[PDB]
Symmetry: D2
């Protein structure tokens, strides 16, 4: 098992308080990993600093080939990466083998292409006798923090564009899911020059905080919850660091009277619950039109109750557990408060789903209002709420009356309603007659309280570069 | 007699709070007293912005483009009067405003009208089988924008045109000392845009500015000012995850190699070190000069700087105006004094006040300055240029990059090789070769590090004000 | 009385050669006899374009942009008069020209004024170590430009603005039947652009057009016409390897599925199959109709198409005009007669000429035409629409794609799925869904296959008239 | 033995028709006799392409991109033997192929994998109220591609990658003398792509090329060759309005100013005037030298060019190889002999045949040549460079621009000012400064004027192989 922090030339174990990496299926310990010391953080940033000298001066072709190699490396060990990510997070193995790894590998490969393909306004004489041109240069040293929900994927989202942009990076995985990142570190170490990627581990309160507050770091990119985005943003206020923030969502799913209701029910069954709802695009806040509302609640209830989790044979599991006990408790807590509200019904699930480990019952919350906490607040759990709306009600406006703005979907056979919703929804993403489907060419990222900056697509790479104007006078 | 009222929705309204004394900074005389926005007027402006967003955000690129074309026309129709108003308010020499500023302002509005209809994105298509994807660029929401005082009207163009053109609505505040051209423009805009798309409030940063940037309904804040104010805006936005667009000043390095056309360098710095009395983010103010040429450069610049004319009765004959206020002069003076206190440093010309009335400081050259010197390390924002020597075992590029700032820069050399190497390595939003200062509305302006991020002018300013959206349609 | 003279550099001139009889197409009466440009005059136009290129190719995007804005402004000042002159010349109903064409023309000039300033390319930078590359889009040369008779003034815009905008100079020829607005515009342009940048000559394809296409100083030829002229231009270009820009006709397929809003479909075709008397490269003319609704659609279409007003004294009451010439009407009539010859084909309304005076044809519905029929295979360019049935066995899209044409199409259904799938697979420069005919200046119009290639409107038009260049500078 | 079979759809198939005598151009001895494709096999290859297009045009960028990456892997796995095969077939010095060509070929497949997923267009949105437009870049159809013999394997990469990348299907013909690497690569590709996406046929331009370019199903023709072949390809396409993609040679001007670095100029011209025996479309062949340095340059170049090594047994030691064929060697010799008969021209070195055996021509310097001379005006495509004196009353840029060709060019000067002015005014697809010849896969290659249009390498080649489509959806 790979246990060591990558710092410049060398691998070394932690020096600080150990963290208890648990297997969330059963609650048992996998390994104990010591956090990086402040000194260890300092040397990582330093190795990133001295590596930026050479790395920022590389050609796009040089950087692109590096990324292709990284992709080849992950591809070779795809099965091992999967199993190790299935252990760390208790994700069903086949969902990881089939869904995550190939997207991950495809991502490294997308960015190999994107690197050699940036555009800008054309070079020429905008002023007489002066030739202007636009470049995109590196920014500096990037401090990157990933969450626990898709460890290895998040790493790809954070590393590839920043490295591709000619930056150097100090990366910290979530305190509970450092495993795939340390295995990756090893392969990366063989491919990149020393210090272009450095990987430290530890708790956010201590290791995260020191990284985002380190004076040498010019950009900080985080994916997590709002609380932490605010901390990052407050820390940036000190030295005017660039920020890249993806802070979660509460994806509205507008279901009109004329939707293919069978496909809707199947869409929410998969995409409301995948990764036990620990996905920031989860199909979780549903708006059902008056006519189909009762039909939907029942049909979905029936569908959700059949979702398989925690079986002995992992190939038969559709859903894994929540990452930790604190996280399950947080989910249990949200639901309990909702079930307390007299106008709400819990039609299936609603309780803890596990003797050991951190499973929760796939849950359906019916009859929730725009005013309910369950509708206003990210639950990040296998939980879906349903809200009814009238013909007299603007379901798009209801959907836009939110703090979140990451992703959304609309279901209808109708063209007029599909297109009008798609033009008016205030969301980074809007799917029509599906949900959740990502592709590495297309940008992921929100507005409002979901934050700013993209992941995937050429825009991710534009976020990690600086536009520069060069103007030569013809004397 | 003059444009004095705030623009709040469909209401023109005098502020109801504390008055500001807007001074003719040539004479120190009071031009006018302007009551600032009350808290409730701040609220009404944001509320008009919110109401206007509904319609305005659903306009087409052609409608917004045509609106922007009209503002330019309106400005153009009143170029004489805008220029005369800004000259009075800021003390800028009238012909400088007429020939340099107004044509660039009008061009800006016109540029963005074109940019509005010309946004690109990855092509639409099936990236996943049976799913058509396409990318849009939609409005973000309500912008609070704050302008500084060095170019009141041009800053407004930069702040407004790309925000409006993105289909955003705006609450705009000019700086406390220079609200006049903004109030004037607000009158003309009211007759062109639907009400509530653009709203204009006046007041102090600590009061009106602070309420504007902390308003829950404001989704993005854009400011051009100093580093302290940026750190303020970032601290506010931390409370609600507001998007930010920050231009925080610079200390433009000017690398002069030995094989430089030394005359051209002198003439450049004479203009671009001192234009607008050095009250310009991109001022040619931190000169690095190779050992071979240092001494000659120091003397020729010294002599050239000393002939810069100002505070003449015939405004035609003035090349720069005064600093904006007493406090700014006093601050510039102190930088000069502290630097002159240094044994290795020589003030070769100027370095003293340039008028009894008003706020002129003398064009100053500070020679013998070292990389450790405050005068090299920190932004002066007055008519002051420092010269540092570099030797052959020194890396002028490294030296220039060793800075908290990253907005603009120039390199001077007859040698295409050294130029291109310099240009490629400089950690500066912009690098001129064998000139300085020259702007064109198609080209982005904006810095790195503590200079901030985001661009003004170019298509990029407009990309900073729109949200990228992925739409995916499942066929089957 | 009327603008009569050719623009040849700094000079307005009567044409030296034989005269065209410019006819009023709704009465058949003569409007004016106009002398063609002689060969020496074609030489002088092109020489003046060569001299103008020296300067013009070297102007800034901003300069060219300001110039296109001023032309937009000029056409706008005289909009009514342009409309009336176009109406008279072309038989178009006065209010269609006034409300549809003029605003679109003006906006085309304004659109390109922006596009001129917003070209992108790959970013500059070091793709090879020590080498700084950049991409420019430079002018191509002298453009020989030829317009068809369908929309004289709009085609001018589509041809002049991107070409001039790209920094090319131009020698433009309207169609022999419709030079009138082109010459009125020529005077206006002459007061804005440096002499020789735009040149306007008049005359026939086989004489003046030929002499222009073949001139060894012309580096690019842009034509909008029929497949026949396109082949002629292509062959002419072959001998000198000229760049070509060709829009050569379309036979727009209209797929109507069982779940279409038939009311909308019928009103769409009533308007778009017949606008400008069907003298439109994009006319809704080849309908494919699912068996379930085929019957109703034919009957409902017949009824609406029979109410179409034309040839009335109240020109505000007219919906469509006449064909351009007797030649064109007779060509249309021969198409309709041959279609009427087939046993399986039924003409439900119209089918004969529609005036005693002038060149009107009766709006025509042709029912039961199949895939191998001439009325489906070939462009009629008359107020004539065929309807063809497909069953569930049939792949309506495969049918549509089985064509030499590739310009425009539409698909009508309330089902999002079927609509997107059609849009993905249609082999046509443009596909409208649940509408037709709608153009917008930011969006490109242009065919594949035998409709030619290259674009009008959008930045792609402007890309067509520029040469991409790679500059690479060695640092070492 | 080797790979000799043609690739038609699923089947590998021997050529049935007249044999081509494939020679080793170093010795003039036969390598293999290869029978050409019959009319039937040509027809079968086009038909396979037609079938394969139904699926392949419907694939995602991701799957096409993956396919390109795999083709790259396969070439890389067999880098050395492709190197050996090309060195033998073409006479290229082994190390040059191994180190220059193979790297660039592999990189070329990998760059297009990228490009395939990174196409941009104008952003989707509502440009007309209530209508959502988006732009797609869709495949064109079946591509007929013809490569020359100067870089068999590289040309194939340029022809296939953007073609297949854009989702088109291909019938491809290598040059008659040089099919060996294409037939090898053909077997690797059949293991990677779906059946019929790529088809390889062999034979002469006059038979096989002619039939390929005339086939009614081929929608686009791409050729790199001489101007003569471009003209007739154009004539063919004229009949049927096929898209063309023409790269038709160069005569690259090399402007050497007085303040140039003459060691670097001489070293540049030594390599790039003569690399691949001057059989390169970008060869630095047409030199313009300023009066002040004209005599030193001629002398220094002459002596640099006389030390060029070729025709040695130790191939590692050879710097250039022979011409492809006896016809080519003789074509160059007559170019040189006709230059020699000019009394004003001086042949400073070579000018004669360069081997008993094989098709070597001696590296040649032609001094004293004029703007009026054949040797200046026409592409020689041999190891031959011409030098032409210019004065201060002469505009070297204007002189360079007075040519039928427009592919590539360089300028040599240490002066910033002269380089940028030359780069901005030169009428060439490409301008290097203080280097020549260097290519990079992100950066477009392709000419203007009689060099033809359309690009190789870069996202532009991929644009050339796709159709821009406007899709507009009505919300009503």
């Amino acid at each position: 098992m790979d246990t060591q922090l990558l710092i410049g030339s060398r691998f070394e174990a932690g020096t600080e308080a150990e963290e208890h990496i648990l297997n969330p299926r059963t609650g048992a310990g996998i390994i104990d990993l010591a956090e990086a010391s402040h000194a260890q953080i300092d040397a990582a940033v330093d190795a990133a600093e001295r590596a930026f000298v050479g790395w920022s001066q590389t050609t796009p072709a040089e950087r692109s080939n590096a990324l292709l190699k990284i992709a080849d490396a992950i591809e070779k060990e795809a099965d091992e990466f999967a199993a190790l990510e299935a252990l760390n997070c208790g994700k069903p193995i086949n969902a990881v083998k089939n869904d995550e790894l190939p997207a991950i590998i495809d991502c490294w490969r997308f960015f190999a292409g994107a690197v050699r393909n940036l555009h800008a306004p054309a070079a020429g004489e905008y002023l007489p006798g002066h030739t202007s041109m636009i470049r995109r240069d590196p920014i500096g040293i990037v401090g990157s923090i990933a969450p626990w929900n898709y460890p290895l994927m998040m790493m790809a989202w954070k590393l590839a564009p920043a490295i591709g942009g000619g930056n150097t990076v100090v990366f910290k995985p979530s305190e509970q899911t450092p495993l795939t990142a340390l295995k990756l570190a090893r392969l990366i170490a063989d491919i990149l020059p020393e210090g272009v990627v450095n990987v430290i581990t530890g708790r956010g309160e201590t290791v995260g905080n020191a990284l985002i507050n380190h004076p040498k770091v010019g950009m900080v990119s985080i994916t997590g919850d709002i609380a932490t985005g605010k901390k990052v943003l407050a820390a940036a206020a000190k030295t005017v660091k660039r920020t890249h923030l993806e802070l979660g969502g509460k994806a509205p799913v507008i279901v009109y009277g004329d939707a293919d209701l069978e496909a809707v029910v199947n869409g929410i069954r998969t995409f409301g619950y995948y990764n036990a709802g620990q996905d920031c695009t989860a199909a979780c806040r549903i708006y059902a039109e008056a006519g189909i509302y009762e039909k939907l609640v029942a049909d979905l209830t029936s569908a959700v109750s059949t979702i398989r989790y925690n079986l002995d044979d992992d190939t038969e599991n559709e859903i894994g557990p929540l990452i930790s006990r604190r996280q399950r408790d947080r989910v249990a807590s949200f639901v309990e408060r909702a079930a307390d509200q007299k106008h709400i019904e819990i039609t299936t699930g609603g309780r803890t789903g596990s003797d050991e480990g951190f499973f929760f019952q796939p849950t359906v919350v019916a009859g929730a209002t725009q005013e309910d906490e369950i509708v206003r607040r990210e639950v990040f759990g296998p939980v879906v709420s349903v809200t009814r709306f009238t013909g007299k009600d603007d379901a798009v406006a209801w959907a836009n009356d939110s703090d979140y703005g990451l992703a959304s979907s609309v279901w209808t056979k109708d063209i007029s309603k599909a297109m009008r919703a798609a033009s008016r929804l205030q969301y980074g993403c809007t799917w029509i007659n599906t949900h959740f489907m990502l592709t590495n060419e297309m940008p992921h990222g929100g507005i409002k309280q979901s934050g700013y900056g993209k992941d995937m697509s050429v825009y991710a790479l534009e976020d990690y570069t600086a536009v520069r104007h060069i103007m030569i006078n013809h004397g």
